RNA sequence: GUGAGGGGAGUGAAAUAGAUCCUGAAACCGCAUGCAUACAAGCAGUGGGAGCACCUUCGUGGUGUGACUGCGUACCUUUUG
RNA sequence: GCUAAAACUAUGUGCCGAAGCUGCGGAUGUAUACUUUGUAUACGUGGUAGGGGAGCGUUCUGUAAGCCGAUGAAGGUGUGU
């Protein structure tokens, strides 16, 4: 079994027990998140592709925690024009652990 | 109040040289050359954070084209057929399935050509 | 456990002494002594002095056997230079550098 | 005529890559047992058995 | 890091044989270059060689249209002053059939070490026989 | 070589405080280990990325290196540029 | 490299294609309402010469006959954050 899910404006292909990082969510650590907008479920020969979505499919995951990625440096410089500026960045994320996939 | 510059100046130069680790020749030893090298690296990184998305989309499209032509369709016809069939799976997942699961991709192509018909 | 000898302030360029150093790096002490004894380089005399000093230290201070020793480590460093003046044509003067070097020899079994 | 750019340490060492020294031909003299330079009289005046100095 | 690149140790190269009798030069060359580069495989990776081996037989029976048999020119320069040498298609095909295919496919492959490695997988022969029976090539009709 | 210089012993809290001797940065020059490098053309990086070596909580981990590959003609000043 | 084109004329159906637009996450300027709020909504955030606003570090004076320090200050050299 593997499934296709939507989260954070992007799509993921997941299997049971996978740990993945998605865009920051408002759920608390230790909570359960349920996806009911599954796009595709595959079990060997059994294939289900949703027209927009698969009716009745579910993917359940647990929230592990939140964090920030590694720092990125932004540099801008216009040569011969006396211009230069800099800034740093660290993007937020949420970590999920897939606990159940049902078609 | 006379101020000496040594400690702060040494700290700034040492930070620049530390960021210049790994470059060839004077680019990792000499402060002037190293300082010019770090700024150019930053500019390149800024540009390539935009170029990366285009490069990966091109890779996905090529793999989807190969899978479609294995199943008897072209890339453009397969994309149009999926759009007509209302499937909204994106190219990244489509290319992953094309690489790692031939049967599922064959099912997707069957759906697309059935919608095209 | 290596035995060390140092020769500091030898009046020769380190670039010239290194040619002799890499000639004997890693060899048996008897073979190195033969090479130095029949070399015609000026640095051979200095390198031989350092090597015999190291062998004597190993034999006397540490009570080792000369038959098993080898040249395990050797390198040449730069020393303090002397500054001189050389007069050239038309009233111009140039600076002359007289270079020295330090020689380090380690022997071990 | 002079350089327009300073030469790097890598190219300097590449030029010097042909500067290594070479060992001489040494041989143990059978008559006296000492190591001597091949085809040369020993330091104490022996060559192929004959002696030069009384 | 969910999009994976092909691993060179896991790439399988297959052997195909193509007969050039009566085919158009460039329209055969494009397909040959595609299969040499590996564009027909779902594991295609730009920095990895994934293509196949292509043997070409009857290389002197390839064709060109129009008046290109007499009018198409091949140039080279020996780097001595005035050293430009010139030939045409109909003499070159009689003399060295393999160099025509070399030029045509080299112009369509990438210019670099990977391209040099890719072009090594094409074997061109004038007659109808090839010495690669041990590799058991499969007939490919392109 | 009754030289210079060093290795022991000894003094001292400390001798890599040993005489132009507190601390001992950078340019510059050596030795050692790991990886890469002798069919390939350019501001030397950047975004990808196989393999190898060591460490390891054995990992979707850490450190070093970087085959192959897309893009890419330094900085300052003065100028319509 | 291309000739019932991979050329030219006309028509049609798809697709590719930018830092443009949309999606998700984050920061900030101004204004309107919450009738303190730091909160929501709306519109903005390419920049030379210039104008305006807000800050980081360095040496010295008071606070300081205080607080830290041979169970190790300043300085030097790595690592993590």
Residues spanned by the domain of D33: 1-54
Rounded CA–C1' distance between B24 and G46, in angstroms: 34
Q: How far apart are CA C2 and CA C109, in angstroms?
A: 8
Residue with the two structure tokens 């990792």? B28
Task: Report CA C24 to chain centroid distance, whole Å.
Answer: 11
Cα gap C29→B32, rounded to integer Å: 48
The 3-state DSSP class for residue C30 equals helix
**Alpha-carbon distance C103 to C25, whole Å?**
13
Strands E15-19 and D50-51, sheet pairing: unpaired
State residue A82 phi and psi, 5-degree precision: 60, 45
Rounded to a whole number, what is the distance in angstroms from the first to the last CA of chain A?
9
CA B30 to chain centre: 32
Which bases along strand G come within 7 Å of a protein CB atom?
1-4, 6, 14-19, 23-26, 47-49, 57-60, 75-79
The residues spanned by each domain of chain B are: 1-117
Q: Any atom of strand F under 7 A from CB of E112?
A: yes
**How distant is C1' of F38 from CA of A24, in Å?**
53
- DSSP annotation of C47 reads H
Token readout for C94 is: 């140039």
Identify the residue among D13, D24, D42 best suited for mutation to test binding to C, counting C beta carbons within 10 A and taking the highest: D24
Question: Listing from the earlier edge strand, what are the strands of the sheet with E53-57?
Answer: E122-124, E53-57, E15-19, E138-139
User: d(Cα A62, Cα A39) in Å, to the nearest integer?
Assistant: 20
User: Which of C76, C78, C50, C66 shows the shortest CA–CA distance to C109?
Assistant: C66
- Residue B7's contacts (CB-CB under 8 Å, 6 or more residues apart) are none
Structure token pair of residue B105: 């991709």
| A98 within 8 A of A2, measured Cβ to Cβ | no
Residue A62 near residue A97 (C-beta atoms within 8 A): yes
Q: C96: which strand partners? A: C84
DSSP label of D48: T
Q: Is the CB of B17 under 7 A from strand G?
A: no
What is the Rg, in whole angstroms, of the alpha carbon atoms belonging to chain E? 17
Kindly report the length of chain C. Answer: 109
Phi, psi of B115 (to 5 degrees): -70, -35
DSSP state of A27: P
According to DSSP, residue C90 is labeled: G
SS3 track for chain E: CCCCCCCHHHCCCCEEEEECCCCEHHHHHHHHHHHHHCCCCCCCCCCCCCCCEEEEECHHHCECCCCHHHHCEEEEECCCCCCEEEEEHHHHHHHCHHHHHHHHHHCCCCCCHHHHHHHCCEEECCCCCCCCHHHCCEECCC
Residue C24 near residue C74, CB atoms below 8 Å = yes
* C105 vs C70: CA distance, rounded Å: 11
Cβ–Cβ under 8 Å, residues A25 and A79: no
Q: What is the rounded distance in angstroms from the CA atom of residue C38 to the CA atom of residue D28?
A: 13
Q: Give the DSSP letter of residue C103.
A: E
Distance between CA atoms of C97 and C14, rounded to whole angstroms? 13
- The alpha carbon of residue B100 is apart from the nearest alpha carbon of chain A, in Å, by 12
Distinct helix (H) and strand (E) counts, chain C = 3, 5
Task: Name residue, tokens 């002397």.
Answer: C82
Which residues, 6+ apart, have CB-to-CB distance to B43 below 8 Å?
A75, A76, A77
Tokens of B93: 């997942």
B89 vs A11, A47, A73: nearest CB = A11
- Give the residue among E128, E90, E86, E117 at the shortest CA–CA distance from E13: E117
Contact C19 D19 (CB under 8 A): yes
Residue D23 near residue D8 (C-beta atoms within 8 A): no
- Secondary structure E strands in A15-80: 19-22, 32-35, 40-43, 46-49, 58-68, 72-78
Nearest C-alpha in D relative to B26: D8
**Structural determination approach:** cryo-EM
What residues does each domain of chain A span? Answer: 1-103
- What's the residue count for chain E? 142
For chain D, helix (H) and strand (E) counts, in that order, are: 1, 4
State how far Cα E8 lies from the chain centre.
22
Contact (CB<8Å) E44/B62 = yes
The backbone torsions φ and ψ at residue D43, rounded to the nearest 5 degrees and listed phi first, read: -65, -25
Q: How far is CA E84 from the centre of its chain?
A: 25
Structure tokens at D5: 């750019």
3-state secondary structure of B90: coil
CA–CA dist A89, B45 (Å, integer): 13
Using CB atoms, pick whichever of D21, D26, D35 lies closest to residue C23: D21
Q: How far is CA C39 from CA A54, C73, D21, in A?
A: 89, 20, 10
Residue of chain B minimizing CA distance to D7: B25
Longest dimension (CA), chain D: 66
| Residues pairing with A89 in the sheet | A72
Helix axes B75-85, B102-116, angle to 10 degrees: 70
In three-state secondary structure terms, C36 is helix
What's the CA gap between E19 and E62, in Å, rounded? 9
DSSP β-bridge partners for residue A86: A75
**Residue B18 contacts by C-beta under 8 Å, 6 or more apart in sequence?**
none
Q: Please list the residues that pair with A22 across neighbouring strands.
A: A94
Region at B67 (left for phi over 0; alpha for psi -120 to 50; beta for the rest): alpha
E8 and E80 in contact (C-beta within 8 Å)?
no
**CA–CA dist E99, E6 (Å, integer):** 32
């Amino acid at each position: 079994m593997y499934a296709v899910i939507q989260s954070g404006g992007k799509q993921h292909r997941v299997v049971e027990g996978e740990t993945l990082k998605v865009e920051l969510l408002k759920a608390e650590s230790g909570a359960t998140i349920t996806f009911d907008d599954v796009l595709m479920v595959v079990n060997g020969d059994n294939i289900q592709i949703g027209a927009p979505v698969v009716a009745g499919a579910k993917v359940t995951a647990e929230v592990i925690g939140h964090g920030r990625h590694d720092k990125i440096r932004i540099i801008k410089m216009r040569r011969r024009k006396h211009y230069r500026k800099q800034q740093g960045h660290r993007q937020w994320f949420t970590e999920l652990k897939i606990t159940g996939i049902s078609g | 109040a006379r101020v000496k510059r040594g400690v702060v100046a040494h700290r700034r130069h040492k930070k620049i040289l530390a960021r210049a680790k790994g470059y060839y020749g004077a680019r990792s030893r000499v402060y002037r050359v190293a300082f010019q090298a770090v700024i150019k690296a930053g500019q390149y990184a800024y540009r390539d954070r935009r170029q990366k998305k285009r490069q990966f989309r091109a890779l996905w499209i090529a793999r989807i084209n190969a899978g479609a032509r294995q199943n008897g369709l072209s890339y453009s016809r397969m994309i149009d057929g999926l759009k007509k069939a209302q499937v909204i799976i994106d190219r990244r997942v489509l290319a992953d399935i094309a690489m790692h699961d031939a049967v599922a991709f064959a099912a997707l192509a069957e759906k697309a050509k059935g919608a095209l018909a | 456990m290596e035995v060390t000898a140092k020769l500091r302030g030898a009046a020769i360029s380190a670039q010239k002494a290194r040619l002799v150093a890499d000639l004997i790096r890693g060899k048996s002490v008897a073979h190195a002594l033969n090479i130095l004894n029949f070399s015609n380089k000026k640095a051979a005399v200095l390198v031989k002095k350092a090597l015999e000093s190291a062998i004597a230290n190993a034999e006397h201070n540490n009570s080792l056997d000369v038959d098993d020793l080898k040249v395990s480590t050797i390198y040449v460093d730069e020393g303090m230079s002397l500054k001189r003046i050389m007069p050239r044509a038309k009233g111009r003067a140039d600076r002359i550098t007289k270079r020295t070097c330090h020689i380090t020899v380690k022997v071990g079994v | 005529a002079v350089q327009q750019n300073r030469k790097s340490r890598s190219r300097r060492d590449m030029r010097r890559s042909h500067d290594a020294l070479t060992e001489n031909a040494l041989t143990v003299d059978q008559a006296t047992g000492e190591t001597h330079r091949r085809h040369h009289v020993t330091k104490d005046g022996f060559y192929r058995g004959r002696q030069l100095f009384a | 890091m969910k999009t994976l690149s092909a691993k060179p140790a896991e790439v399988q190269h297959d052997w195909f044989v193509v007969d050039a009798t009566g085919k158009t030069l460039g329209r055969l060359a494009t397909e040959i270059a595609r299969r040499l580069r590996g564009k027909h495989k779902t594991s295609y990776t730009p920095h990895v060689d994934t293509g196949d081996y292509i043997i070409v037989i009857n290389a002197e029976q390839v064709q060109v249209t129009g008046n290109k048999a007499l009018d198409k020119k091949y140039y080279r320069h020996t780097e001595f002053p005035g050293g430009l040498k010139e030939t045409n298609f109909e003499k070159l095909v009689a003399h060295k059939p393999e160099e025509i295919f070399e030029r045509a496919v080299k112009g369509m492959l990438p210019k670099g070490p990977l391209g040099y490695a890719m072009i090594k997988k094409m074997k061109v022969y004038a007659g109808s026989e090839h010495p690669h029976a041990a590799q058991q090539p499969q007939v490919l009709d392109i």
